[PDB]
Amino acid sequence: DAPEKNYERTMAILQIESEKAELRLKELEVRRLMRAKGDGPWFQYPTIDKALIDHSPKATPDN
Amino acid sequence: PGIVELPSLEDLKVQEVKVSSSVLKAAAHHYGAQCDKPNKEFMLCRWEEKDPRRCLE
């Protein structure tokens, strides 16, 4: 290989691997924040569906 | 929490229907015919307010 080719190929490798490393660090920080706060699309543990509630008039009024 | 708000003993005084349940059951069909309107006003108020204190009058 030419030194130019190896040099610029090394630069492409370094850019790809540095971008992957920054995305892994951001992924760790995102997972930490979403587990702590629960406001993201991850760590959404189920609650009861409110569509199961009967909203009809019952046999007694006070409900 | 907050203090519950109960109506007074004067606000609960009313002239009672002091007849037995057989008297009521014998008069029941004509009572449901003749006394329809305040009964249904009360039961509408009772199912909408969901509170007896809001349904006294």
JSON list of C-alpha atoms in Angstrom, two decimals:
[
{"chain": "A", "resi": 1, "resn": "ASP", "atom": "CA", "xyz": [0.00, 0.00, 0.00]},
{"chain": "A", "resi": 2, "resn": "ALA", "atom": "CA", "xyz": [0.96, 3.60, -0.50]},
{"chain": "A", "resi": 3, "resn": "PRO", "atom": "CA", "xyz": [1.56, 5.58, 2.72]},
{"chain": "A", "resi": 4, "resn": "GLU", "atom": "CA", "xyz": [-1.23, 7.93, 1.60]},
{"chain": "A", "resi": 5, "resn": "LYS", "atom": "CA", "xyz": [-3.67, 5.02, 1.37]},
{"chain": "A", "resi": 6, "resn": "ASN", "atom": "CA", "xyz": [-2.74, 3.56, 4.76]},
{"chain": "A", "resi": 7, "resn": "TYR", "atom": "CA", "xyz": [-2.79, 7.03, 6.32]},
{"chain": "A", "resi": 8, "resn": "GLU", "atom": "CA", "xyz": [-6.25, 8.01, 5.11]},
{"chain": "A", "resi": 9, "resn": "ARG", "atom": "CA", "xyz": [-7.60, 4.50, 5.70]},
{"chain": "A", "resi": 10, "resn": "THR", "atom": "CA", "xyz": [-6.33, 4.86, 9.28]},
{"chain": "A", "resi": 11, "resn": "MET", "atom": "CA", "xyz": [-8.21, 8.15, 9.52]},
{"chain": "A", "resi": 12, "resn": "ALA", "atom": "CA", "xyz": [-11.43, 6.49, 8.34]},
{"chain": "A", "resi": 13, "resn": "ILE", "atom": "CA", "xyz": [-10.93, 3.68, 10.89]},
{"chain": "A", "resi": 14, "resn": "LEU", "atom": "CA", "xyz": [-10.29, 6.19, 13.68]},
{"chain": "A", "resi": 15, "resn": "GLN", "atom": "CA", "xyz": [-13.37, 8.23, 12.80]},
{"chain": "A", "resi": 16, "resn": "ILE", "atom": "CA", "xyz": [-15.62, 5.14, 12.77]},
{"chain": "A", "resi": 17, "resn": "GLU", "atom": "CA", "xyz": [-14.25, 3.79, 16.04]},
{"chain": "A", "resi": 18, "resn": "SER", "atom": "CA", "xyz": [-14.34, 7.16, 17.83]},
{"chain": "A", "resi": 19, "resn": "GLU", "atom": "CA", "xyz": [-17.96, 7.66, 16.76]},
{"chain": "A", "resi": 20, "resn": "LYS", "atom": "CA", "xyz": [-18.83, 4.17, 18.02]},
{"chain": "A", "resi": 21, "resn": "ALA", "atom": "CA", "xyz": [-17.12, 4.93, 21.34]},
{"chain": "A", "resi": 22, "resn": "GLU", "atom": "CA", "xyz": [-18.98, 8.22, 21.79]},
{"chain": "A", "resi": 23, "resn": "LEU", "atom": "CA", "xyz": [-22.25, 6.46, 21.01]},
{"chain": "A", "resi": 24, "resn": "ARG", "atom": "CA", "xyz": [-21.49, 3.77, 23.61]},
{"chain": "A", "resi": 25, "resn": "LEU", "atom": "CA", "xyz": [-20.82, 6.43, 26.26]},
{"chain": "A", "resi": 26, "resn": "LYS", "atom": "CA", "xyz": [-24.05, 8.23, 25.34]},
{"chain": "A", "resi": 27, "resn": "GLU", "atom": "CA", "xyz": [-25.89, 4.89, 25.44]},
{"chain": "A", "resi": 28, "resn": "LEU", "atom": "CA", "xyz": [-24.67, 4.26, 29.00]},
{"chain": "A", "resi": 29, "resn": "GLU", "atom": "CA", "xyz": [-25.72, 7.75, 30.11]},
{"chain": "A", "resi": 30, "resn": "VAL", "atom": "CA", "xyz": [-29.14, 7.42, 28.42]},
{"chain": "A", "resi": 31, "resn": "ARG", "atom": "CA", "xyz": [-29.75, 4.04, 30.12]},
{"chain": "A", "resi": 32, "resn": "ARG", "atom": "CA", "xyz": [-28.78, 5.53, 33.48]},
{"chain": "A", "resi": 33, "resn": "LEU", "atom": "CA", "xyz": [-31.16, 8.49, 33.08]},
{"chain": "A", "resi": 34, "resn": "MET", "atom": "CA", "xyz": [-34.08, 6.41, 31.80]},
{"chain": "A", "resi": 35, "resn": "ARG", "atom": "CA", "xyz": [-33.77, 3.88, 34.61]},
{"chain": "A", "resi": 36, "resn": "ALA", "atom": "CA", "xyz": [-33.51, 6.69, 37.17]},
{"chain": "A", "resi": 37, "resn": "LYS", "atom": "CA", "xyz": [-36.40, 8.83, 35.91]},
{"chain": "A", "resi": 38, "resn": "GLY", "atom": "CA", "xyz": [-38.69, 6.44, 34.02]},
{"chain": "A", "resi": 39, "resn": "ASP", "atom": "CA", "xyz": [-39.67, 9.13, 31.51]},
{"chain": "A", "resi": 40, "resn": "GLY", "atom": "CA", "xyz": [-38.21, 7.53, 28.39]},
{"chain": "A", "resi": 41, "resn": "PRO", "atom": "CA", "xyz": [-39.29, 4.69, 26.11]},
{"chain": "A", "resi": 42, "resn": "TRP", "atom": "CA", "xyz": [-37.11, 2.22, 28.03]},
{"chain": "A", "resi": 43, "resn": "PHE", "atom": "CA", "xyz": [-37.69, 0.72, 31.49]},
{"chain": "A", "resi": 44, "resn": "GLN", "atom": "CA", "xyz": [-41.45, 1.15, 31.02]},
{"chain": "A", "resi": 45, "resn": "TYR", "atom": "CA", "xyz": [-42.78, -1.46, 33.37]},
{"chain": "A", "resi": 46, "resn": "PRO", "atom": "CA", "xyz": [-46.51, -2.19, 33.04]},
{"chain": "A", "resi": 47, "resn": "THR", "atom": "CA", "xyz": [-49.31, -0.59, 35.00]},
{"chain": "A", "resi": 48, "resn": "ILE", "atom": "CA", "xyz": [-53.00, -1.45, 34.80]},
{"chain": "A", "resi": 49, "resn": "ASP", "atom": "CA", "xyz": [-54.78, -0.57, 31.56]},
{"chain": "A", "resi": 50, "resn": "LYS", "atom": "CA", "xyz": [-57.49, 1.97, 32.39]},
{"chain": "A", "resi": 51, "resn": "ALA", "atom": "CA", "xyz": [-59.64, 0.63, 29.54]},
{"chain": "A", "resi": 52, "resn": "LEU", "atom": "CA", "xyz": [-60.57, -2.26, 31.86]},
{"chain": "A", "resi": 53, "resn": "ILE", "atom": "CA", "xyz": [-62.54, 0.09, 34.14]},
{"chain": "A", "resi": 54, "resn": "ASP", "atom": "CA", "xyz": [-66.32, -0.15, 33.97]},
{"chain": "A", "resi": 55, "resn": "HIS", "atom": "CA", "xyz": [-67.74, 3.39, 33.97]},
{"chain": "A", "resi": 56, "resn": "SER", "atom": "CA", "xyz": [-71.41, 2.38, 34.03]},
{"chain": "A", "resi": 57, "resn": "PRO", "atom": "CA", "xyz": [-73.84, 3.37, 36.80]},
{"chain": "A", "resi": 58, "resn": "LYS", "atom": "CA", "xyz": [-73.51, 0.74, 39.48]},
{"chain": "A", "resi": 59, "resn": "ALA", "atom": "CA", "xyz": [-76.08, -0.78, 41.82]},
{"chain": "A", "resi": 60, "resn": "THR", "atom": "CA", "xyz": [-75.25, 1.73, 44.56]},
{"chain": "A", "resi": 61, "resn": "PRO", "atom": "CA", "xyz": [-74.60, 5.44, 43.87]},
{"chain": "A", "resi": 62, "resn": "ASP", "atom": "CA", "xyz": [-71.52, 6.19, 45.99]},
{"chain": "A", "resi": 63, "resn": "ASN", "atom": "CA", "xyz": [-68.73, 4.96, 43.71]},
{"chain": "B", "resi": 1, "resn": "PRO", "atom": "CA", "xyz": [-55.73, 15.64, 55.86]},
{"chain": "B", "resi": 2, "resn": "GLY", "atom": "CA", "xyz": [-58.81, 17.86, 55.86]},
{"chain": "B", "resi": 3, "resn": "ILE", "atom": "CA", "xyz": [-61.78, 17.98, 58.19]},
{"chain": "B", "resi": 4, "resn": "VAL", "atom": "CA", "xyz": [-64.85, 16.11, 56.96]},
{"chain": "B", "resi": 5, "resn": "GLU", "atom": "CA", "xyz": [-67.86, 18.40, 56.58]},
{"chain": "B", "resi": 6, "resn": "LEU", "atom": "CA", "xyz": [-71.03, 16.89, 57.99]},
{"chain": "B", "resi": 7, "resn": "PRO", "atom": "CA", "xyz": [-74.47, 18.53, 57.95]},
{"chain": "B", "resi": 8, "resn": "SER", "atom": "CA", "xyz": [-75.95, 19.47, 61.30]},
{"chain": "B", "resi": 9, "resn": "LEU", "atom": "CA", "xyz": [-78.68, 17.62, 63.17]},
{"chain": "B", "resi": 10, "resn": "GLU", "atom": "CA", "xyz": [-81.13, 20.39, 62.27]},
{"chain": "B", "resi": 11, "resn": "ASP", "atom": "CA", "xyz": [-80.41, 19.94, 58.55]},
{"chain": "B", "resi": 12, "resn": "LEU", "atom": "CA", "xyz": [-81.32, 16.25, 58.82]},
{"chain": "B", "resi": 13, "resn": "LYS", "atom": "CA", "xyz": [-84.71, 16.74, 60.50]},
{"chain": "B", "resi": 14, "resn": "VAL", "atom": "CA", "xyz": [-87.61, 15.72, 58.26]},
{"chain": "B", "resi": 15, "resn": "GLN", "atom": "CA", "xyz": [-91.10, 14.30, 58.78]},
{"chain": "B", "resi": 16, "resn": "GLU", "atom": "CA", "xyz": [-90.47, 10.57, 58.47]},
{"chain": "B", "resi": 17, "resn": "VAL", "atom": "CA", "xyz": [-92.57, 7.99, 56.62]},
{"chain": "B", "resi": 18, "resn": "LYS", "atom": "CA", "xyz": [-93.34, 5.91, 59.71]},
{"chain": "B", "resi": 19, "resn": "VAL", "atom": "CA", "xyz": [-95.11, 3.03, 57.98]},
{"chain": "B", "resi": 20, "resn": "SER", "atom": "CA", "xyz": [-94.03, -0.59, 57.80]},
{"chain": "B", "resi": 21, "resn": "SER", "atom": "CA", "xyz": [-92.55, -2.36, 54.79]},
{"chain": "B", "resi": 22, "resn": "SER", "atom": "CA", "xyz": [-95.78, -4.21, 54.01]},
{"chain": "B", "resi": 23, "resn": "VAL", "atom": "CA", "xyz": [-97.59, -0.85, 53.84]},
{"chain": "B", "resi": 24, "resn": "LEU", "atom": "CA", "xyz": [-94.84, 0.36, 51.50]},
{"chain": "B", "resi": 25, "resn": "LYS", "atom": "CA", "xyz": [-94.97, -2.78, 49.36]},
{"chain": "B", "resi": 26, "resn": "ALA", "atom": "CA", "xyz": [-98.77, -2.58, 49.11]},
{"chain": "B", "resi": 27, "resn": "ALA", "atom": "CA", "xyz": [-98.57, 1.07, 48.07]},
{"chain": "B", "resi": 28, "resn": "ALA", "atom": "CA", "xyz": [-95.41, 0.58, 45.99]},
{"chain": "B", "resi": 29, "resn": "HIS", "atom": "CA", "xyz": [-96.76, 0.51, 42.42]},
{"chain": "B", "resi": 30, "resn": "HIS", "atom": "CA", "xyz": [-99.02, 3.53, 42.86]},
{"chain": "B", "resi": 31, "resn": "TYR", "atom": "CA", "xyz": [-96.16, 5.25, 44.71]},
{"chain": "B", "resi": 32, "resn": "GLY", "atom": "CA", "xyz": [-93.82, 4.68, 41.79]},
{"chain": "B", "resi": 33, "resn": "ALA", "atom": "CA", "xyz": [-96.50, 6.00, 39.46]},
{"chain": "B", "resi": 34, "resn": "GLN", "atom": "CA", "xyz": [-97.57, 9.06, 41.46]},
{"chain": "B", "resi": 35, "resn": "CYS", "atom": "CA", "xyz": [-94.30, 10.10, 43.13]},
{"chain": "B", "resi": 36, "resn": "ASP", "atom": "CA", "xyz": [-92.14, 9.57, 40.04]},
{"chain": "B", "resi": 37, "resn": "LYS", "atom": "CA", "xyz": [-90.65, 13.03, 39.54]},
{"chain": "B", "resi": 38, "resn": "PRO", "atom": "CA", "xyz": [-89.01, 13.93, 42.91]},
{"chain": "B", "resi": 39, "resn": "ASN", "atom": "CA", "xyz": [-87.86, 10.32, 43.29]},
{"chain": "B", "resi": 40, "resn": "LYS", "atom": "CA", "xyz": [-86.11, 10.37, 39.92]},
{"chain": "B", "resi": 41, "resn": "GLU", "atom": "CA", "xyz": [-84.71, 13.84, 40.62]},
{"chain": "B", "resi": 42, "resn": "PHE", "atom": "CA", "xyz": [-83.26, 12.47, 43.87]},
{"chain": "B", "resi": 43, "resn": "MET", "atom": "CA", "xyz": [-81.82, 9.34, 42.30]},
{"chain": "B", "resi": 44, "resn": "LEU", "atom": "CA", "xyz": [-80.33, 11.31, 39.41]},
{"chain": "B", "resi": 45, "resn": "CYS", "atom": "CA", "xyz": [-78.78, 13.67, 41.97]},
{"chain": "B", "resi": 46, "resn": "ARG", "atom": "CA", "xyz": [-77.64, 10.69, 44.01]},
{"chain": "B", "resi": 47, "resn": "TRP", "atom": "CA", "xyz": [-75.90, 8.91, 41.12]},
{"chain": "B", "resi": 48, "resn": "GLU", "atom": "CA", "xyz": [-74.40, 12.13, 39.77]},
{"chain": "B", "resi": 49, "resn": "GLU", "atom": "CA", "xyz": [-73.18, 13.79, 42.97]},
{"chain": "B", "resi": 50, "resn": "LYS", "atom": "CA", "xyz": [-71.98, 10.46, 44.48]},
{"chain": "B", "resi": 51, "resn": "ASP", "atom": "CA", "xyz": [-72.37, 12.15, 47.88]},
{"chain": "B", "resi": 52, "resn": "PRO", "atom": "CA", "xyz": [-75.40, 12.03, 50.21]},
{"chain": "B", "resi": 53, "resn": "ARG", "atom": "CA", "xyz": [-74.55, 15.45, 51.69]},
{"chain": "B", "resi": 54, "resn": "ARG", "atom": "CA", "xyz": [-75.15, 17.03, 48.28]},
{"chain": "B", "resi": 55, "resn": "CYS", "atom": "CA", "xyz": [-78.55, 15.31, 47.97]},
{"chain": "B", "resi": 56, "resn": "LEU", "atom": "CA", "xyz": [-80.37, 16.24, 51.18]},
{"chain": "B", "resi": 57, "resn": "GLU", "atom": "CA", "xyz": [-82.96, 18.74, 49.91]}
]
